[PDB]
Amino acid sequence: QQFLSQFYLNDQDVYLTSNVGGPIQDENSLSAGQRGATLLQDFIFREKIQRFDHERVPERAVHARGTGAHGTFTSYGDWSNLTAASFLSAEGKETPMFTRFSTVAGSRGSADTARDVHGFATRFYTDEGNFDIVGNNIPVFFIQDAILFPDLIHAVKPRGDNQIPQAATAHDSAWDFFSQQPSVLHTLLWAMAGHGIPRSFRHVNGFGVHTFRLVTDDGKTKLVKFHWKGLQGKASFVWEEAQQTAGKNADFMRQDLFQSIQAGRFPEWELGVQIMQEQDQLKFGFDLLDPTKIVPEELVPVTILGKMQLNRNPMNYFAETEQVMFQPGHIVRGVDFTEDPLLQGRLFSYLDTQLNRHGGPNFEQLPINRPRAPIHNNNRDGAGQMFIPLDPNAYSPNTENKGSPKQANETVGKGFFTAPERTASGKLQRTLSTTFENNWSQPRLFWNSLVNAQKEFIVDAMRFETSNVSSSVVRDDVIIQLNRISDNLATRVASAIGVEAPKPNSSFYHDNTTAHIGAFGEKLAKLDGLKVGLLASVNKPASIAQGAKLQVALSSVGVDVVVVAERMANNVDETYSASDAVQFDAVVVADGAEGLFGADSFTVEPSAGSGASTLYPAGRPLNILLDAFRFGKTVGALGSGSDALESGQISSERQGVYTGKNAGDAFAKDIKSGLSTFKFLDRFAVDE
Amino acid sequence: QQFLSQFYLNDQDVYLTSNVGGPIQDENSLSAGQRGATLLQDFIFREKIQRFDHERVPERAVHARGTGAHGTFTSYGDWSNLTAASFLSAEGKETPMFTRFSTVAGSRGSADTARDVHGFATRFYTDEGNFDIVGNNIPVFFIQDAILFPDLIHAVKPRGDNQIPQAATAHDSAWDFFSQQPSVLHTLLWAMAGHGIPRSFRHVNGFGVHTFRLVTDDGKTKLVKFHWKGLQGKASFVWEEAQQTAGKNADFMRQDLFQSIQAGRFPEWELGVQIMQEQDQLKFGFDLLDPTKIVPEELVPVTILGKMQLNRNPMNYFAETEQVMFQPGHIVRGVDFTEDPLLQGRLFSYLDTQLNRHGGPNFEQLPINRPRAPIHNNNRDGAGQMFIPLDPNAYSPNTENKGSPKQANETVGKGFFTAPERTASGKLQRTLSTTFENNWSQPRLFWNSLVNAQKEFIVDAMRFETSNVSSSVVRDDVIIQLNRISDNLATRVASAIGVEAPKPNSSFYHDNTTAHIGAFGEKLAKLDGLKVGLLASVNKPASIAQGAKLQVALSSVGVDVVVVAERMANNVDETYSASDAVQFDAVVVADGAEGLFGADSFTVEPSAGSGASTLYPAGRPLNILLDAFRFGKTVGALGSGSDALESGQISSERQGVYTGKNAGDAFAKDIKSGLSTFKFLDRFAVDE
Amino acid sequence: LQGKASFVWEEAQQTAGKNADFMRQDLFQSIQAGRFPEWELGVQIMQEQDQLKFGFDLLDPTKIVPEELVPVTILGKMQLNRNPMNYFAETEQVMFQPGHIVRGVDFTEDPLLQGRLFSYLDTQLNRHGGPNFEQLPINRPRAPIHNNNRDGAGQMFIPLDPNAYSPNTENKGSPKQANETVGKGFFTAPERTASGKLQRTLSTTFENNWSQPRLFWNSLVNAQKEFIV
Ligand code: HDD
Ligand code: HDD
Ligand SMILES: *[C@@H]1O[C@H](CO[C@@H]2O[C@H](CO)[C@@H](O)[C@H](O)[C@H]2NC(C)=O)[C@@H](O)[C@H](O)[C@H]1NC(C)=O
Ligand SMILES: *[C@@H]1O[C@H](CO)[C@@H](O)[C@H](O)[C@H]1NC(C)=O
Ligand SMILES: *[C@@H]1O[C@H](CO)[C@@H](O)[C@H](O)[C@H]1NC(C)=O
Ligand SMILES: *[C@@H]1O[C@H](CO)[C@@H](O)[C@H](O)[C@H]1NC(C)=O
Ligand SMILES: *[C@@H]1O[C@H](CO)[C@@H](O)[C@H](O)[C@H]1NC(C)=O
Ligand SMILES: *[C@@H]1O[C@H](CO)[C@@H](O)[C@H](O)[C@H]1NC(C)=O
Ligand SMILES: *[C@@H]1O[C@H](CO)[C@@H](O)[C@H](O)[C@H]1NC(C)=O
Ligand SMILES: [Ca+2]
Ligand SMILES: [Ca+2]
Ligand SMILES: [Ca+2]
Ligand SMILES: [Ca+2]
Ligand SMILES: [Ca+2]
Ligand SMILES: [Ca+2]
Ligand SMILES: [Ca+2]
Ligand SMILES: [O]
Ligand SMILES: [O]
């Protein structure tokens, strides 16, 4: 924090000043008499309002909705026989980082829990330059050439005439594009499985997507896939829960991250690479240059390089998070590109687009973008030039500055260099590689590898989405494409949307799998930051007292208990009015609160004699319990709190429903078991 | 449409071209061989991606989230004895209009149904210049001096460190500001009543807020308040239903307006003025220069001037709606300003801020900002200069261009003029007028004038919001200020939030009222665009058939029937999966569908033997009915469909619950009666 | 078609002091007087196989092709005949690009040309302050525009197609792809190839920096040699 603290403005106990250090007041405009017109000579007014009028900058063209944190990387080894990268040069070597997570399609201010691909962008402030791995939470992307990006994004984003719908693929154009461009199918399945609706940014993995090169000082290369393996564990929602979260808390995932860091529950990921040889580009049966293809870990294991920990929130979101400007072109000696046509064109885009955002060329001079390494070059001027170059002779080769700055390359000065054995051959052409043409086998691989419930979640997502596609031509074209993945998938979706069941096409059908590829099916590794909503009553103080007791039994695993009651009495954390099932990973009815959960509570007429509360909507306590159950959450009840389960027609005989005598260790153990499972999949119907 | 049509690009059945008219292809980057690197000389790639990279412009600093429509104004009179404004010069005189509706705090992707003040910005493209009345759906504003705008907005918008929470006042800073700056209280009560959460942009009124001057050709003035009196009727949600809508359809109100216009259901408002004398500024017990004060209609009635109808959607949202740049400084001869310090400073802000949005000075040259009147002046150059001035001598006074362009003033050329009897007097000063100091009497007026349910809505909003305020000091400060409005209001709110019940402070208490000031309590004037969701089943074809029958009996009042079923069969409009109570103004169970509404349906275990549907979440049909009921909506059932009411513990004896033998006229009449009432207020508990 | 004419240095200096606008004024006045200056467009036509045969590299922008080796074939004539109405709007804002290319012309691997292509698209963002510089009157084409590019500050058009992507069915597959065989599309000369290791190097074919300067020097009348000295 040494570096960024030089730019901090501390406004504790100080007098107000203009931006040029003149002390001022700023609460009344200068007027001609008490009730007079405002004077033009009021510079205090105009400077204040001019700053205000110009606060905004263009949102990012994609990934506009996102959230950042500072952290650190630790290398596990001296990787010099693999890469010349300085940040990987020794066991225990540490490098600062900044990471931003995001959705893709929605604008600023859109819901965190929209269904989408998620950005997972990681900057290493290395001692040999900034290195960015600008990744996502899904290892494959929709399209195979960067020139198609505007097509994909215009189709996914809102209609051009009326700008509907926000942050959603559930409209004709998106599905038109997906069916017209079947390369999209692999990412589409990932996003419509649990990966499109994660519980938090701490409960996803990251991926660089593209094949990159690692290169040693002597020019030897390997091809790699970059991975960020999360140490908390994958966790995802079901769609109806993600929708409800969008309505109750648009900031749900950004808030989770912020709070977890404030609580000292620092999320971690291991940096890994699947290490391959130059000769492996086509040998696996798909092209390593094709960003729609994964390398299954059965074919190439993930070699772990080191660990990222996120551990400090920004001081000012705009200055740090909004203004961070990631680029795949932020590359360092020891890494190089490949001819993946999607990567190739990204390189252009991310340098250009910062001109839009920053409004000029000196965006690398913003504190969050600056390197932690010296800058010496002949670049000059531009709007917003914050440095003062001492060299008046800004050219090479010079004698007037004694030949400095000096050229750095592979042999001197630790320069960047292109892997020296890379070659080009062939006619200059605008063509789609024939090696890129199997759009369906890997989608099928993914589909085969999912637990039954998560197959169902894909079907139900596609049914929801395509039922909102007005065009019969598009609906039919979607089914025809899905059928090339799996006749089962296609048939199951078709039945909701008025499309004839398709005949099988066996061209790409196969039964191979890859392990643990879905969002569902594994227990969490860490329970840190999960929440238990304890539904209590101010009329039974002992019910509220159970919060602290339960908390003592859950603190050692980083789980918080939130006491919910009718009003803010002592030791109450939230009111029923302010609460919703989507706030809580588990919901527990406290002993003595059961009287709030009557089955008639949704519809009883709130006459003056009725006893109906004005402190919350009719039925709210029972709505929270029922929504928690239906969404698949851990549900519990203490003592006579179990009567509330009976009112809700929830049997403790069901999986993920727990009762206990009191809030001690025995019950906490069972709630921990529930939270580790995270979602109880037997509450979802599956096609037969 | 003739004017804007000159800028249309029709892309039906044509070849792709670059932006300089060279035919192109745009689907494959140019590569060095089939699997080669992308070439720099690929200008097609770069022009496409550069346009993409630079698509975004800064969102509006406030009112970022909004929706536009074209329309027309028709004057009802020759108003020349009141104002010289040309658009008001004759009975029948038509002027084109563009109107944008918005929230205030949220960024451009935030939910339509956030609770907020709403913008209501109307441009008249008059034959003597663009005239903009940049208003809101609430007649009073939070603050009394424009210099305070960054304070108000920084407090309401997300926290500076983490940018939480989106589009919400339910956080410490906002309530800190409201309690520290009690001028805020009038608008706060309006926004926490129904006016904060309207059903649609068609179901609100508009207000200019400030007092303005109307001025005749001979310099005579009146003071006025501008009104837009809606002809559909006020209609608003309850908080829980606004939240649910945010989660299910972030575009709900934008969609409503687009659809209503495409249906020919054109919304209308009458422009009106409260006409006052110069000598009335301090006569009524408050200052007409104070924008936190209404003029009750009992004191000065609204004189109706003419009518706005909105009747055409944009062709391209970005080009038209996103780029429209309103300004109160877009004033015409016949109107003038007052010394309201809020208005005074607005004039500076809206000219300045377009520089940010447009990135240069020529924003009035965008098609949507152009006038429909001649432009002739000596302004020159600037980035993005779209015109070519023929006069090379761009100064006055000139002889080299024969004294042209010629000065226009009161007596020649129909120039703008400041009302000539306006004066200034007094010492130059930065002070708050003593006439502005009663922050509490008018909030009490507003409070007194509400039906009991809407008082409860204000209480319940403030309890929800302030329960989210962490600071005890802030909570107490809020209660102190509320208590100066009404001890009842303050006491009712305090009891939810752990603040001691305040003792009365009666300085500003009174019993006066003003009529029909809330959002609740009157029947709707028109039912256009309201929706009845008919919950049917594909397994009972006759249930689906009731849709068309009911539709026939409701078409004449502009109400649509939407048939909901399990899957998209013939005559089904939506699936259950895709549906929610919040989509429908009334919900009706079709005869034959009752089997879907079992009371065990939320929690039944969906095993192979259970017959649980995979086509929708467990309990969805009953959830839609129960939500509709709890939210206050018209609910009904046809035939045996009434069994579903029983399952949901909904009695037909309750108000706004209707049973019918069949889908004929009698039942249609009951549904129209329910829609007219709109919300059944007896379903909400009230304090005692 | 007027003829080469030049100053001596001391005369050019004196002109800078007396009339900074001397050449701009000459052009403006000549056009106002109806004395329209003309140039003939010509090409030295060579074969693909001629890149190195002349003893210097055709990709090297420091080398001329002497007209003794390859004559100038005259294609047509330019006449300049109308001054701007507003200098800022027309002259200051004109934004030239070598990337403004049409079917029937293509690039070569001259490393100076290659990078120019990037620069002239980028730099207009600085000048115009946004992406829609081709919409300025002086930059607009006299030919239809139909594409899926959208938005950006200063968007002067209103696209009617709400489905701005390919491939689409929602707009019936339009705008349609144009290439060598359909729609008169631009196309890269199809026999061009690449070969070799990716590298940052100076071609050895570019290394004679002095023979052509000497050719030029030898070809001057004595006075003009003196003027160089
Ligand atoms: C050629 C266009 C293009 C293509 C094909 C991609 N992107 Fe992209 N992306 C951009 C063009 C772009 C951009 C327009 O340049 C953005 C918007 C803001 C920015 O700085 O770059 C960006 C932002 C952006 C961000 C947000 C960084 C942040 O948090 O500020 C992430 C995580 C990604 N992208 C990730 C990817 C992934 C993993 C891709 C495929 C493997 C991908 N993008 C393809
Ligand atoms: C001195 C600052 C200031 C103050 C006190 C206000 N405004 Fe404002 N307003 C702006 C500064 C501003 C702005 C920053 O200039 C905006 C942002 C975008 C724009 O064009 O103007 C704007 C936008 C804006 C819009 C959106 C117009 C559109 O749809 O594009 C509306 C409807 C209003 N304002 C309405 C009001 C009302 C009724 C006010 C009080 C009576 C008010 N504003 C006070
Ligand atoms: C409005 O404009 C006219 C401008 O008329 C000029 O006035 C001066 C003094 O009479 C005279 O020297 C010019 O020749 C006049 N005519 C023109 C075309 O310039 C003023 O005369 C009015 O007084 C102005 N003021 C008002 C209140 O309209
Ligand atoms: C690199 O390889 C050589 C030969 O295998 C070996 O001696 C050395 O230990 C390796 N270096 C590192 C840092 O592991
Ligand atoms: C690298 O640069 C050095 C120093 O400028 C230069 O002399 C050397 O020849 C270069 N080597 C390579 C690999 O180009
Ligand atoms: C699995 O993949 C291998 C790898 O190509 C392939 O040869 C084999 O046929 C596949 N087996 C199944 C069950 O699809
Ligand atoms: C305006 O006023 C005069 C006098 O009252 C009268 O002659 C005339 O009717 C009025 N004109 C209009 C436009 O109403
Ligand atoms: C209330 O209204 C009455 C009108 O009968 C008026 O005389 C009085 O001044 C008003 N009082 C307040 C406090 O607003
Ligand atoms: C040119 O495009 C046409 C029409 O899209 C396409 O069908 C044809 O195959 C293309 N030919 C070439 C040369 O790529
Ligand atoms: Ca290719
Ligand atoms: Ca159990
Ligand atoms: Ca004042
Ligand atoms: Ca619900
Ligand atoms: Ca009834
Ligand atoms: Ca700019
Ligand atoms: Ca070279
Ligand atoms: O992206
Ligand atoms: O505003």
- Residue B478's domain is classified under what CATH number? 1.20.1370.20
What is the residue whose two structure tokens read 């050219």? A395
Give the C-alpha separation, A122 to A132, whole Å. Answer: 6
Only one residue has tokens 């009991």, namely B452
Between the CA of residue C124 and those of A447, B362, B475, C96, C141, what are the distances in Å?
Answer: 48, 17, 54, 9, 17
Question: CB C177 to CB B8 under 8 A?
Answer: no
Distance in Å, CA B355 to ligand 15 centroid: 9
Q: What is the DSSP letter of B318?
A: I
DSSP output for A480-535: HHHHHH-HHHHHHHHTTTT-PPPPP-GGG------TT-SSSSS--S--TT-EEEEE
- By Cβ distance, the residue of A53, A61, A240 closest to B52 is A61
Q: Are C168 and B5 spatial neighbours (Cβ–Cβ below 8 Å)?
A: no
Residue among B288, B336, B327 nearest B144 (CA): B288
A452 is catalytic: no
With beta carbons under 8 A apart, name residues in chain B contacting A50: 352
Chain A residues closer than 8 Å to B33 by CB: 424-429
Q: How far is C69 from chain A (nearest CA, A)?
A: 30
Inter-helix orientation angle B149-156/A43-53, to 10°: 30
Distances (CA, A) of B127 to B69, B86, B93, B375: 20, 7, 11, 11
Structural element, H or E, at residue B412: none
Q: Name the amino acid, one letter, at B126.
A: T
Is B495 in contact with A567 (Cβ distance < 8 A)?
yes
B319 and B254 assigned to the same domain:
yes
Contact assessment for residue A454 and residue A518, using Cβ atoms and an 8 Å cutoff: yes
**Two structure tokens written together for A226:** 């970059």
Output the residue whose Cα is nearest ligand 6's atom 11. Answer: A512
Question: What residues form DSSP beta bridges with B212?
Answer: B224
Residue B78 CA: nearest ligand 7 atom is 13
> Measured between alpha carbons, how far is A89 from A202 in angstroms, rounded to an integer?
27
Residue A63 appears among annotated catalytic residues:
yes
Q: Which residue has its alpha carbon closest to ligand 17 atom 1? A: A62
Closest CA to A448 of A665, A88, A186: A186
Identity of residue A641: G
Copy the structure tokens of residue A148: 């198609």
- B624 DSSP assignment: H
Distance (Å, whole) CA A375 – CA A396: 16
- The type of residue at A288 is L
Q: For residue A19, count other CB atoms closer than 10 A to its CB.
A: 9
Region at A548 (left for phi over 0; alpha for psi -120 to 50; beta for the rest): alpha
- Entry field: residues in chain B: 688
Neighbours of C210 (CB within 10 A): 8
Chain C positions touching B4 (Cβ under 8 A) are 158
Of the candidates A534, A508, C100, A252, the one whose C-alpha atom is nearest the C-alpha of residue B44 is C100
Of the candidates C228, C155, C224, C191, the one whose C-alpha atom is nearest the C-alpha of residue C4 is C224
CATH number of the domain where residue A181 is located: 2.40.180.10
What are C's interface residues with A at a Cβ cutoff of 8 A?
122, 125-126, 131, 148-150, 159, 161-170, 179, 188-200
Beta carbons of C171 and C161 less than 8 angstroms apart = yes
Residue B347 · residue B98 · CB < 8 Å: no
* B172 touches B474 (CB < 8 A): yes
Contacts of B416 by beta carbon, 8 Å cutoff, 6+ apart: B331, B332, B333, B408
A411 CA from centroid of ligand 5 (Å): 6
The answer to whether residues A498 and A537 belong to one domain is no
A271 and A195 both lie in a single domain: yes
The residue whose CB lies within 8 Å of the most ligand 8 atoms, and thus the one to mutate among B510, B511, B513, B514, is: B510
From the list B231, B256, B196, the residue with the least C-alpha distance to B531 is B256
- Say if residue B150 is in the same domain as residue B289: yes
Kindly give the number of the ligand 9 atom that is closest to the alpha carbon of A430: 14
- Contact criterion met (CB below 8 Å) for B492 and A615: no
Check CB contact under 8 Å for B567 and A496. yes
Question: How distant is the Cα of C188 from the closest Cα of chain B, in angstroms?
Answer: 9
Number of domains in chain B: 3
* Cβ-defined contacts of A91-97 (< 8 Å, 24+): A95/A124, A95/A125, A95/A126, A95/A127, A96/A3, A96/A70, A96/A71, A96/A72, A96/A124, A96/A125, A96/A372, A97/A70, A97/A71, A97/A72, A97/A73, A97/A122, A97/A123, A97/A124, A97/A125, A97/A308, A97/A310
Question: Among residues A537, A510, A512, which one has the least CA distance to residue A620?
Answer: A537
Residues B520 and B573 in one domain: no
Whose alpha carbon is nearest atom 5 of ligand 4?
A: A81
Structure tokens at B260: 């209503």
Provide residues with CB under 6 Å of ligand 4. Answer: A 78, 80-81
The arrangement of strands across the sheet holding B31-32 comes to B31-32, A423-429, C193-197
B416 in the same domain as B433: no
Which helix or strand (DSSP H or E) is residue B560 part of? strand B560-565
Q: Indicate the residue among A391, A410, A428 that finishes a domain.
A: A428
Mutate to test the interface with C, among A56, A156, A176 (most CBs of C within 10 A): A176
What CATH number corresponds to the domain at position A666?
Answer: 3.40.50.880
Three-state secondary structure string covering A100-142: EEECCCCCCCCCCCCCCCCEEEEEEEECCEEEEEEEECCCCCC
Q: Rounded distance, CA B429 to CA A31, Å?
A: 6
Q: Tell me: do A481 and A534 sit in the same domain.
A: no
CB B614 within 8 A of CB B659: no
Strand partners, A634: A586
Interface test with C, best of A339, A423, A471, A474 (most C CBs within 10 A): A423
Q: Which residues of B are designated catalytic? A: 63, 136
Give the residue, by CA position, lying nearest to ligand 6 atom 3. A512
Cβ neighbours, 10 Å, residue B397:
6
CB B287 within 8 A of CB A35: yes
Cα–Cα distance measured from residue B232 to residue B251, given in angstroms and rounded to the nearest whole number: 20
Question: What are the chain B neighbours of C91 within 8 Å (beta carbons)?
Answer: none
One domain for residues B204 and B240: yes
Given a contact cutoff of 8 angstroms between Cβ atoms, the answer to whether B587 and B564 are in contact is no
Give the Cα separation of A142 and A164 in Å (integer): 22
Residue of A nearest to B351 (CA): A53
**Ligand 5 neighbours (beta carbon < 6 A):** A 407, 409-412
| Residue corresponding to tokens 């889908």 | B663
Ligand 18 contacts CB of residue B64 (under 6 A) = no
Is residue B54 domain-shared with residue B165, that is, in the same domain? yes
d(CA B203, CA A527): 47
Catalytic residue among A130, A136, A438, A439: A136
Are residues B647 and B595 in contact, defined by beta-carbon separation less than 8 angstroms? Answer: no
Contact partners, residue B179, CB within 8 Å, separation at least 6:
B474, B477, B478, B480, B481
Residue list, ligand 1 pocket, CB within 6 Å: A 60-63, 66, 100, 102, 119, 121, 134-136, 141, 146, 149, 209-210, 291, 324-326, 342, 345-346, 349-350, 353; B 49, 53
Q: Give yes or no for a contact between B544 and B562, defined as CB atoms under 8 angstroms apart.
A: no
Instruction: Tell whether B132 and B267 lie within a shared domain.
Output: yes
Contact B124, B73 (CB under 8 A): yes
Chain A residue with minimum CA distance to C125: A355
Of the candidates B320, B289, A612, the one whose C-alpha atom is nearest the C-alpha of residue C156 is: B320
Residues B312-315: contacts with CB within 8 Å, 24+ apart?
B312/B1, B312/B69, B312/B70, B312/B71, B312/B261, B313/A161, B313/A162, B313/B69, B313/B70, B313/B258, B313/B261, B313/B262, B314/A161, B314/A162, B314/B68, B314/B69, B314/B70, B315/A161, B315/B4, B315/B8, B315/C158, B315/C159, B315/C160
| 3-class state of residue C188 by DSSP | coil
Between chain B and chain C, how many beta carbons pairs sit less than 8 Å apart? 225
Last residue of a domain, one of A465, A495, A526: A526
Closest CA to B305 of B208, B449, B403: B208
Do the Cβ atoms of A143 and A149 come closer than 8 Å? yes
Phi, psi at residue A71, to the nearest 5°?
Answer: -165, -165
Same domain, A498 and A623: no
Residue A586, CA distances (Å) to A114, A255, A525, A678, C116 in order? 22, 18, 17, 9, 61
State the ligand closest to the CA atom of C183: 9
- For A545, B302, B303, the CA distances from B224, given in Å and listed in that order, are 60, 10, 10
C-chain CB neighbours of B379 within 8 Å are: none
**A209 neighbors A141 (Cβ within 8 angstroms):** yes
Nearest CA to B462 out of B485, B435, B489 is that of B489
Residues of chain A found within 8 Å of residue B322, distances taken between Cβ atoms: 163
- Give the whole-angstrom CA distance, residue C210 versus residue B420: 80
Ligand 7 centroid – CA B83 distance (Å) = 12
End position of a domain, from candidates A403, A428, A453: A428
C-alpha pair distances (Å), A77 with each of A268, A353, A541: 18, 36, 56
Within 13 A of A7's CA, how many CA atoms are on the CB side?
15
- The residue segments making up the domain with residue B549 are 527-688
Distance, in Å, from the CA atom of A22 to the CA atom of A24, rounded to the nearest integer, reads: 6
What is the spatial distance between Cα B563 and Cα B31, in angstroms, rounded to a whole number?
53
Q: Which of A269, C160, A688, C88 is nearest to B317 (CA)?
A: C160
Distance CA A574, CA A88 (A): 47
Give the technique used to solve this structure.
X-ray
A375 in the same domain as A240: yes
- Residue A73 β-bridge partners: A95, A308
